[PDB]
Amino acid sequence: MRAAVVYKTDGHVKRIEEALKRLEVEVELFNQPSEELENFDFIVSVGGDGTILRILQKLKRCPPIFGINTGRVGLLTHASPENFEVELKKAVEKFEVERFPRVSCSAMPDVLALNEIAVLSRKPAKMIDVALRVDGVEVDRIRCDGFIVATQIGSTGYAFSAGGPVVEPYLECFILIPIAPFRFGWKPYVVSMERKIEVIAEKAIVVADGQKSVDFDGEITIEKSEFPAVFFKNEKRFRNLFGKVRSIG
Amino acid sequence: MRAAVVYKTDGHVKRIEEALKRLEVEVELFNQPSEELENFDFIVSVGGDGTILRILQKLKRCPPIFGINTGRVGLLTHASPENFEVELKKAVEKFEVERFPRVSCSAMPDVLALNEIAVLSRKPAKMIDVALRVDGVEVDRIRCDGFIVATQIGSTGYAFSAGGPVVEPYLECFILIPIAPFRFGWKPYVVSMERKIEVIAEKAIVVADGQKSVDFDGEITIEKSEFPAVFFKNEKRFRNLFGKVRSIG
Amino acid sequence: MRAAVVYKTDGHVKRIEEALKRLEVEVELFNQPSEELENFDFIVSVGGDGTILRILQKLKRCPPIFGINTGRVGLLTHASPENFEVELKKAVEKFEVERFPRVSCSAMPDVLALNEIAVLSRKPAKMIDVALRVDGVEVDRIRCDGFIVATQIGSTGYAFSAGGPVVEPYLECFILIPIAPFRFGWKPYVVSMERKIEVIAEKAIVVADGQKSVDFDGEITIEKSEFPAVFFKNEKRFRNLFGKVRSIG
Amino acid sequence: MRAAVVYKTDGHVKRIEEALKRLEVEVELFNQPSEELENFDFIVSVGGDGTILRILQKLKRCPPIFGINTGRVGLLTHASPENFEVELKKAVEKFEVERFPRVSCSAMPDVLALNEIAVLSRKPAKMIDVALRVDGVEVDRIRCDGFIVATQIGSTGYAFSAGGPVVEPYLECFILIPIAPFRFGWKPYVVSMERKIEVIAEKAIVVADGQKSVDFDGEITIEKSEFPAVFFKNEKRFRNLFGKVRSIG
Ligand SMILES: NC(=O)c1ccc[n+]([C@@H]2O[C@H](COP(=O)([O-])OP(=O)(O)OC[C@H]3O[C@@H](n4cnc5c(N)ncnc54)[C@H](OP(=O)(O)O)[C@@H]3O)[C@@H](O)[C@H]2O)c1
Ligand SMILES: NC(=O)c1ccc[n+]([C@@H]2O[C@H](COP(=O)([O-])OP(=O)(O)OC[C@H]3O[C@@H](n4cnc5c(N)ncnc54)[C@H](OP(=O)(O)O)[C@@H]3O)[C@@H](O)[C@H]2O)c1
Ligand SMILES: NC(=O)c1ccc[n+]([C@@H]2O[C@H](COP(=O)([O-])OP(=O)(O)OC[C@H]3O[C@@H](n4cnc5c(N)ncnc54)[C@H](OP(=O)(O)O)[C@@H]3O)[C@@H](O)[C@H]2O)c1
Ligand SMILES: NC(=O)c1ccc[n+]([C@@H]2O[C@H](COP(=O)([O-])OP(=O)(O)OC[C@H]3O[C@@H](n4cnc5c(N)ncnc54)[C@H](OP(=O)(O)O)[C@@H]3O)[C@@H](O)[C@H]2O)c1
Numbered sequence A, B, C, D: 001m002r003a004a005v006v007y008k009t010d011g012h013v014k015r016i017e018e019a020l021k022r023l024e025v026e027v028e029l030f031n032q033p034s035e036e037l038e039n040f041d042f043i044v045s046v047g048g049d050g051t052i053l054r055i056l057q058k059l060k061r062c063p064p065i066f067g068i069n070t071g072r073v074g075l076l077t078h079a080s081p082e083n084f085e086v087e088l089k090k091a092v093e094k095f096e097v098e099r100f101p102r103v104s105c106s107a108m109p110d111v112l113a114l115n116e117i118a119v120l121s122r123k124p125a126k127m128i129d130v131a132l133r134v135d136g137v138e139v140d141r142i143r144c145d146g147f148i149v150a151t152q153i154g155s156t157g158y159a160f161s162a163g164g165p166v167v168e169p170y171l172e173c174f175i176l177i178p179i180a181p182f183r184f185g186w187k188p189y190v191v192s193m194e195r196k197i198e199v200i201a202e203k204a205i206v207v208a209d210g211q212k213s214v215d216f217d218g219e220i221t222i223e224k225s226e227f228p229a230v231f232f233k234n235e236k237r238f239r240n241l242f243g244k245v246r247s248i249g
Helices: A013-022 A035-039 A049-056 A084-094 A237-246 B013-022 B035-039 B049-056 B084-094 B237-246 C013-022 C035-039 C049-056 C084-094 C237-246 D013-022 D035-039 D049-056 D084-094 D237-246
Strands: A002-007 A026-030 A042-047 A065-069 A097-100 A103-105 A108-113 A116-121 A128-134 A137-144 A146-151 A174-179 A189-191 A197-208 A212-224 A229-232 B002-007 B026-030 B042-047 B065-069 B097-100 B103-105 B116-121 B128-134 B137-144 B146-151 B174-179 B189-191 B197-208 B212-224 B229-232 C002-007 C026-030 C042-047 C065-069 C097-100 C103-105 C116-121 C128-134 C137-144 C146-151 C174-179 C189-191 C197-208 C212-224 C229-232 D002-007 D026-030 D042-047 D065-069 D097-100 D103-105 D108-113 D116-121 D128-134 D137-144 D146-151 D174-179 D189-191 D197-208 D212-224 D229-232
Touching: A002 A013, A002 A035, A013 A026, A013 A042, A013 A084, A042 A049, A049 A065, A065 A084, A065 A229, A108 A197, A108 A212, A116 A128, A116 A212, A128 A146, A128 A174, A137 A146, A137 A174, A137 B237, A146 A197, A237 B137, B002 B013, B002 B035, B002 B049, B013 B026, B013 B042, B013 B084, B042 B049, B049 B065, B065 B084, B065 B229, B103 B146, B116 B128, B116 B212, B128 B146, B128 B174, B137 B146, B137 B174, B146 B197, C002 C013, C002 C035, C002 C049, C013 C026, C013 C042, C013 C084, C042 C049, C049 C065, C065 C084, C065 C229, C103 C146, C116 C128, C116 C212, C128 C146, C128 C174, C137 C146, C137 C174, C137 D237, C146 C197, C237 D137, D002 D013, D002 D035, D013 D026, D013 D042, D013 D084, D042 D049, D049 D065, D065 D084, D065 D229, D108 D197, D108 D212, D116 D128, D116 D212, D128 D146, D128 D174, D137 D146, D137 D174, D146 D197
Parallel strands: A002 A026, A002 A042, A042 A065, B002 B026, B002 B042, B042 B065, C002 C026, C002 C042, C042 C065, D002 D026, D002 D042, D042 D065
Antiparallel strands: A097 A229, A103 A108, A103 A212, A116 A146, A116 A197, A128 A137, A128 A197, A146 A174, A174 A189, A197 A212, B097 B229, B103 B212, B116 B146, B116 B197, B128 B137, B128 B197, B146 B174, B174 B189, B197 B212, C097 C229, C103 C212, C116 C146, C116 C197, C128 C137, C128 C197, C146 C174, C174 C189, C197 C212, D097 D229, D103 D108, D103 D212, D116 D146, D116 D197, D128 D137, D128 D197, D146 D174, D174 D189, D197 D212
16 A cells, blocks of 8 residues: 655654554655645545645545644544554554545536535625525525535534534535624524535635635535545544534634 | 314314315314324314424324414415415325424333424523433533424424524434523534434423423433324425525514 | 621631631621621622522622632632632721622512523423513514523623623623524613613513512513622622633533 | 715705705715815715715714615614605704714724724635733633624624624623634623723734724724714614614615
């Protein structure tokens, strides 16, 4: 096997190299993500949740990712720098995998998002008027700072901050929620991920996973893609969800 | 075929009877639901969602229910008294059916809930300390007036009032949410309805769909039963959801 | 001077007695508060905020209260048992005083509330329809588990759990907020404590500071009384507020 | 007397000219605000709440404003185009006035805000780390899209959208509230307007009343100014608050 180790800072990189060596895995080192990372049997990510998002932006077909958390909460990670060698060994020897859907949006065809597509005002302190359709039906029209279309994995990201519910990783769905909605009443809406979401807004910017973005006007379609994020199975993922969420900051 | 008409007040009951009779259906009227409603091919309810919740509490096997909304929002109803005739003919002719899961709790194993199981302080104005586990993991413990375990169908009821999300009727899940939580941070949690929910509390009551209740002390488990609620297919269910929610009051 | 020591459990009571005695203060111990507490120059309470709420319910004219926190957050307390001695000496020597207004409601004209008057359904799990007027204007009508009329001091209690704002203790106002409102939009309202509040509801109870309650049907008026709560000046009150709130649980 | 009539569109301007003439008032017409508007006995504003904000940005000492609402809610306005002639006549003949505090911020010395100062990320979809101090005490540190320091008049603006309480116009205070706070728990804080607010944020933009703005880094002080907004007394202002708020969109 050949693995890619992608790191932001090189604190623990030597020990990771030595672990993968003891495991008879060939190692290539990267300090920035690239599409070349598709050419590996697996990817070791050193950093945080954000680091995994940036790696994912470079992958269409996704080799399984093992995350070592130096970041903070690490909802996407499998180990810390203190316990990684035991966890990495178990992960590669078992080689069990887990998949989470990513979505696309029509304003950025070849971009994929694990957390959310967000549609925001191009100018801060400026509202946009957002119309929401789902499978062709008009669901809402609200003036707001922006509007989030998140997966369940994204329920703990921006959607969370906007007031959304925590949804467990293994319940596939969309969370549709506004940021600073200027209306007396509003609610987050949770719908099946097999549906097609349409957002219409003038003078907007669309943003996938806080990374790639483009200005747009009018209609954008968001739908589940065929290219999921792939991670080594983290067998305590559901258990760890609720403690991690309560630590968010 | 034979139908039961269940009403609270004598609404358009003679008219509805006449419509069934022109469809070659035999009718029997019920001022109150009973277990006798199982001995019918289908059930027409005249009332609001609350009437339908009371029909269901008397049914294990559920003949498909057609709801005529005399109440308020009528998320469980199919028509108005000003248009029932046409949807009713359409329904019995096609006889297309739709099912939503019900849950039961161990404190009252024989009673089924479509909306939610709620665990409240036995004395109003007193908090209770509620511990929540899901498939055996301690997910939270929180001081509160009560705690709601709802289905997606129940996301528009008591859970909605506690601050929960609107979940579409075809996405199967539990919403777990406190009533007046005395804590700085809290979120509703949305989890798979395949999971087992455990609630532990002292000096408490348990209520199913607002209808049946009993005092309890200690652990109760809530889980998905084998006896879903059966309605005629409402083809506009998802598209109707949005305007009905905004009308909530 | 003579002081009353009121406690729930025999905490640091012998120690506290000894400290008062070295300040040339005479002491009498109270296992339960009574109207007899008016015949003292000051009152030391050993307990939490709840103990202080119970002292106050027995006082019209209020000797200044010094609180030793054995409970939880102790927004109404002055010290811990691990530091009471020093703040207590400091307090009796300077004898600087601080007052917060109390309110009364017409259902129980003789009982005063520092935190809030709460109007709840008499039966748990049942909503009540609450109409709210302020100086005679109909401000709202809403179906809910209950409705809270709090002072700024009460903004960190039941009102906080219902979703209310944190108001500093020196900004005099009412917070008006429902418990589990069954409606698409709602807000808490903050108004001048000089205004008269009218609540109308049937099949209800009214509760003052969590302590005294009575059944009522119809209109009640809540207004500012002439008998404020009197504590020794806590010089860190405002700065302490913020960390205590975040610790709420 | 000499009045300035400031309008966005000229639909009803002729009738306003004729009304002021019948009242023996000299009229000057403006289709954009300017500092020259200080030179008048009163100002008639035709447009909405936003129109009043833009006028106010050009005034240090403020002549009394009478607002004719063609906008939407009109919390700041006195009449509609259907009833203005009766209301204008009563307003000028009585000449009773009402004042609401405006605040300044140190990053824009000569700018005044009626609603709020908002401190936002310069880049959309980017959080800033905001530290909040009040009278020198550290109150909070939160990662967020932005942070609002509103007056009570602003409680129905951006602060409202971020989740803040409705505060009546005659209760002077600050509302301190984050936009999209990335934290498990948070609350709006309501404090006395006699206090000094300090916000510290890197890579921010500060915005007064959605109008004037400047990029800044580090510490900004917000405090009540000596230059209030002055309006003709609207004797139904408190009464109208609650209906207007429920109509917000
Ligand atoms: N809440 C907000 O107001 C806000 C605003 C914009 C974006 N975001 C989130 O940040 C993501 C991209 O970030 P960016 O480059 O703009 O900033 P970023 O610095 O990469 O991320 C900001 C924070 O979000 C955390 N995070 C990322 N995914 C998460 C997940 N799904 N659950 C819980 N926390 C998660 C990050 O974790 P680590 O520290 O471990 O890397 C970090 O603490 C977006 O996908 C969006 O979900 C949040
Ligand atoms: N929100 C609260 O503070 C609160 C408190 C107790 C109970 N409830 C809800 O009321 C239900 C029945 O309890 P009850 O007998 O005490 O009250 P109820 O009077 O029988 O019904 C309460 C109200 O909720 C509506 N409703 C019922 N199911 C709904 C659904 N899932 N989505 C949206 N609205 C729904 C009813 O509609 P109709 O007018 O058409 O009948 C009625 O107006 C419970 O299952 C619970 O969901 C809510
Ligand atoms: N949040 C809810 O769901 C709910 C329900 C009922 C009552 N309450 C609150 O409890 C108070 C007393 O009622 P009770 O006898 O039923 O309960 P309690 O057990 O006497 O007190 C309830 C809890 O609230 C705390 N508390 C009291 N006043 C507070 C204040 N203004 N700010 C922050 N925390 C405060 C107490 O602190 P200590 O631990 O230090 O004593 C205690 O932990 C009421 O006035 C009401 O404010 C809240
Ligand atoms: N809620 C949000 O996400 C958001 C975002 C940015 C700014 N704002 C608010 O808008 C103000 C400046 O606006 P801008 O030029 O960016 O946009 P704007 O177009 O002038 O105003 C946006 C909306 O806010 C309304 N409004 C202004 N002051 C209000 C008040 N205090 N109470 C209730 N509604 C009020 C306006 O009323 P009319 O239609 O009558 O003119 C308009 O409907 C700011 O002071 C801020 O309060 C809100």
